[PDB]
Design a protein around this nucleic acid. Structure first.
Lengths: 101, 101
RNA sequence: GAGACAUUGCACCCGGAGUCUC
RNA sequence: GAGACAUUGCACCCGGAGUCUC
């Protein structure tokens, strides 16, 4: 009982604000998760599972681990955003090996 | 007048068959473009611009140049498929730099 | 088609992109 | 909604994914 998130490639924030215009979350999420690293991409939808969250992509665990240990429960526009690692992280990293490496 | 395709990252076949079930093109396209290299992905739709073609992705020009100089106008199921380089190639290669390289 | 109310959630999946007609 | 007929074409873009109602 009681599972665990654990660090895995990147992370995903949750409990986001419920009064943002979606694009406002990218300007804030894609502006704070890159200052101390380099954001590769973010995932924000309007489905039940994607309600009040936004998966962020970095490149290595040590990059997202540094971004997750900086805004741990931080106030965005009017609520504390909780950060949680992404056990699945960017699914393109499963075939990205063909990038050039 | 008279432009040129030129080699660029990967390629795209055209004049494909007009009696395939779509999945049959992937079994043939994704089976011959990998034997002499390593296919990264293929693009086949049903739009006017995507009529009788299938963009293939490799990794480097020398990989697609080798695949394009092997099946130049080859018969698939009942027609000669013409191969043409993809000046745009996979658009993810524009931000894939964050893969790990 | 759209809006309000719900959920505290590991998503990057999926479907369309040429006209014509029943 | 689907099928036939068209186009010989550098696409990987885009839109949905919680219910309730007008």
């Amino acid at each position: 009982a009681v599972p665990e998130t654990r660090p895995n490639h990147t992370i995903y924030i949750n409990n986001l604000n419920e009064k943002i215009k979606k694009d406002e979350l990218k300007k804030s999420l894609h502006a704070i998760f890159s200052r101390f690293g380099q954001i590769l991409d973010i995932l924000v939808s309007r489905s039940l599972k994607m309600r009040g969250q936004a998966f962020v992509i970095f490149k290595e665990v040590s990059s997202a681990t540094n971004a997750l240990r900086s805004m741990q429960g931080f106030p965005f526009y009017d609520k504390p955003m909780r950060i949680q690692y992404a056990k699945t992280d960017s699914d393109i990293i499963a075939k990205m090996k063909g990038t050039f490496v």
